[PDB]
Amino acid sequence: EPFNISAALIGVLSQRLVRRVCEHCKVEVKPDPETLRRLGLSEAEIQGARLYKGMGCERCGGTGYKGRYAIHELLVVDDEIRHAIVAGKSATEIKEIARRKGMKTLREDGLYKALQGITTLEEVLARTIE
Amino acid sequence: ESAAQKFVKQVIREAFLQDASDIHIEPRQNDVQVRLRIDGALRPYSTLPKGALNAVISVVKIMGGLNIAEKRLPQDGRVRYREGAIDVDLRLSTLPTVYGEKAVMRLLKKASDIPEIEDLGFAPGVFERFKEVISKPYGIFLITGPTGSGKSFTTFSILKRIATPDKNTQTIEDPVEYEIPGINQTQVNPQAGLTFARALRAFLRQDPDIIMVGEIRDSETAKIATEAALTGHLVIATLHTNDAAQAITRLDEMGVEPFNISAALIGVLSQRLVRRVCEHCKVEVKPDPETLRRLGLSEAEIQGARLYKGMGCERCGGTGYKGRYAIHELLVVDDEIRHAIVAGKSATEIKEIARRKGMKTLREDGLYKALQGITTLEEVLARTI
Amino acid sequence: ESAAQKFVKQVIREAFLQDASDIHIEPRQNDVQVRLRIDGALRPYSTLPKGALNAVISVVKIMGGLNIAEKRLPQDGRVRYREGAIDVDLRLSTLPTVYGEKAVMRLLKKASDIPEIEDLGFAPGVFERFKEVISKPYGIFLITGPTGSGKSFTTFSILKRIATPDKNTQTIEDPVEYEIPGINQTQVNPQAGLTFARALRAFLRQDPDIIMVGEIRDSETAKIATEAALTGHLVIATLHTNDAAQAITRLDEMGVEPFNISAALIGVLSQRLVRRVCEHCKVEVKPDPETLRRLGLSEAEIQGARLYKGMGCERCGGTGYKGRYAIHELLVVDDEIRHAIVAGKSATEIKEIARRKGMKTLREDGLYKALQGITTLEEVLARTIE
Ligand SMILES: Nc1ncnc2c1ncn2[C@@H]1O[C@H](COP(=O)(O)OP(=O)(O)OP(=O)(O)O)[C@@H](O)[C@H]1O
Ligand SMILES: Nc1ncnc2c1ncn2[C@@H]1O[C@H](COP(=O)(O)OP(=O)(O)OP(=O)(O)O)[C@@H](O)[C@H]1O
Ligand SMILES: [Cl-]
Ligand SMILES: [Cl-]
Ligand SMILES: [Cl-]
Ligand SMILES: [Cl-]
Ligand SMILES: [Mg+2]
Ligand SMILES: [Mg+2]
Ligand SMILES: [Zn+2]
Ligand SMILES: [Zn+2]
Ligand SMILES: [Zn+2]
């Protein structure tokens, strides 16, 4: 029952595993500002932003990767979401409500960690096609 | 029924010897017309008396394993024909018309008919760029054009060269055409729910290196195909667009975000087939410089320009043509194009960048082959509207 | 020999000689009314006494091999009527009404009646755009209009020019109405399961070049037909929409993805039939210059314009009109209409784009043809809108 869902659900965690850039052949790439822009990054943020990949070396196969790392989407339920569940708004509407109140999406989270060299942007984009 | 049998045998044998692709057995008001498709156009073969219709349809239904009793509904099946040196599979389709059932027999090509890339007909410079693209370790490479323009030949030509025993090569096809050895093939089976998208999702758990998507018809398939490339697989996939740049806009329209296209797409090959001028009745013709101008020929080039046509002789069935030839437009994605995609530029804007970067258009490629007498100018303009 | 036989024979004769499409034999409270439909409108033909009804209804039923005893249920059939020099196929319907059974006989046109595209009635500028559209090697071309506005005539006129013997032309029709030689024709068969969509899907295994879809009326037929255009065949299909641009939005509403419509649609023909001024009672009239301005014409078109209308003579049964003439609205898809389709723009906005790029509206084509004394202002406003 939606009213039982509204009363009980405290949060939803969605996650993905991305491949982790090898530490020993890691290298910078100049990102396209437009890519970052269309990924919802602020123009202040763009100024510094650098991205990374693994050129491939003995320590990582040829792959440029070693290990995996998680990316997260954390929907914390408040009165507004509870209200939206009761009403019956769609998964897409709840998602925009939760995003407005400050929830980061998988791809936003993935991009952030890509901007620190944990993963490539390609890994992120791979994991986040809805 | 033996005279029927006798006729099916001879028409199949003749189509095979003449390189016909399709046999049409068409009941009309008073007779049964029989036509062969050769080089894409239909010719008259013969005429049967209307009384012969059922005997022939019967022979052909049995050959395909179809139901003689069913004449109100369409039917299709496959024919494994063996008769001397002639060894050919046929897709067989029967269809109710106002004057009885019409049968169509498509001759299926084999792996042995698939050329190496060096015999695909690429012009010198474009061929080197093509070798480049198909050799990249991951990304999505799109082959686009209307039906019967050689897409599958090019597709399996590429796999013949890059699908090596150290890779897992996997296809999804509708239906599987050639049994290529060294390559895993899976058929779309809608009666069971195995659609293009369903297979494509399964492929991602099959540890692929190379994936071939026979057809990207829906938005789901476009997205999983792009996820495959972004994951680090090489993807050969087929789309229906009129030129190369329009493949980029079609992925956007189907719901692939430009930043995904930009990260995944390595290149687009648009192609067509043009009929080949009969060597036996070839005649030089003098071009219309108004035409050559309007097609962008520098007056330096227009001065030495010769064009050609087949007069039409017995060797080409009075058509002026024998065989077909391919024309290409290869768009290779580089950094400038990657930027154009994320900046949201149109198909027309993307093409102008590609051209300035050296891509010859379909018309330009065909013009250059017509200037050698491989095809007529008319045939080039008819496939590039 | 009997009076009923003689009346039926006579009224079909009159229908044939006057190009009537339908004969209506209607029981009324104290007599029987017979009307002919000529140039789309009913006109009186004759009156019979109530006592003549069952004899005349029997003659019709026997012709179509219907059941004379069954009078409480509707029946329908066909007869090939042959009398004197006349050889016409007729559709026969009988229906219970409160004063007896009503009969309707429709006179069916033949392949011989299909005109070449040059005589379809196209205005000079639109006819060049028309043949360029039908000349494309693949894509879907939609022909739209209410019943009896000439969709089938236009459709098969096109196929008479383009269905050449180097191509395989295949139709699906409900039913097949003409014997066109050179093309392959298939009739939907409800009893068998041979629906529109079921036959369309089979055509994809029949090596076609031109596919004719008689009716797009369900979502599956709309999706397959657009699919066949996209893969690389020429598709000529009929739709019921009030408008050229509405055919685009209709496909969308019917579930065809807008990106496939943008990719496959080459154009949309909307058409109507208007009545032609009878020559033998044709007379000039003077129009209000104002009434032409309020209809949209500029002052240069008003300056030369002379109007006409028929007074009413025996040749035209007093209507002022004999025969009909088509008026057209031709939407040719270009890049800008493609972007509007992908962008989800409305029918209204798409219409504006088509017009700015040179599409003549139905009314505008109508008025043009009125200023040539082909039809009246009357008829143009009757059969069109803003
Ligand atoms: N490079 C080429 N040169 C000459 N002929 C070719 C070439 N490629 C294909 N053909 C001929 O064209 C026919 C059709 O080619 P193919 O099946 O590749 O077209 P397609 O675009 O895959 O068609 P469909 O749209 O039905 O899948 C082939 O059987 C062969 O006869
Ligand atoms: N271009 C034309 N000019 C004049 N009259 C025409 C024209 N086209 C058709 N007609 C007349 O209109 C009649 C009906 O035409 P047609 O069957 O093409 O209409 P339709 O719109 O397909 O009707 P239906 O609703 O039965 O499918 C024809 O029998 C012919 O008499
Ligand atoms: Cl995952
Ligand atoms: Cl039929
Ligand atoms: Cl082609
Ligand atoms: Cl009308
Ligand atoms: Mg193919
Ligand atoms: Mg009709
Ligand atoms: Zn490394
Ligand atoms: Zn020759
Ligand atoms: Zn008159």
Residue numbers in the entry:
A (entry chain C): 271 to 400
B (entry chain B): 15 to 399
C (entry chain E): 15 to 400
Give verbatim lines from the article.
A third vital component of the TFP biogenesis system is the assembly ATPase (PilF in T. thermophilus). The TFP assembly ATPases are part of the extensive AAA+ superfamily which form molecular motors, using the energy from ATP hydrolysis to drive mechanical transformations. The domain structure of T2SS and TFP biogenesis ATPases is similar, in that they comprise one or more N1 or GSPII domains at the N-terminus, followed by a C-terminal (CTD) and N2 domain- which comprise the ATP binding site. Here we present a combination of X-ray crystallographic and cryoelectron microscopy single particle reconstructions of the PilF hexamer in two states which are used to build molecular models for the complete PilF hexamer and chart its structural transition on binding of ATP.
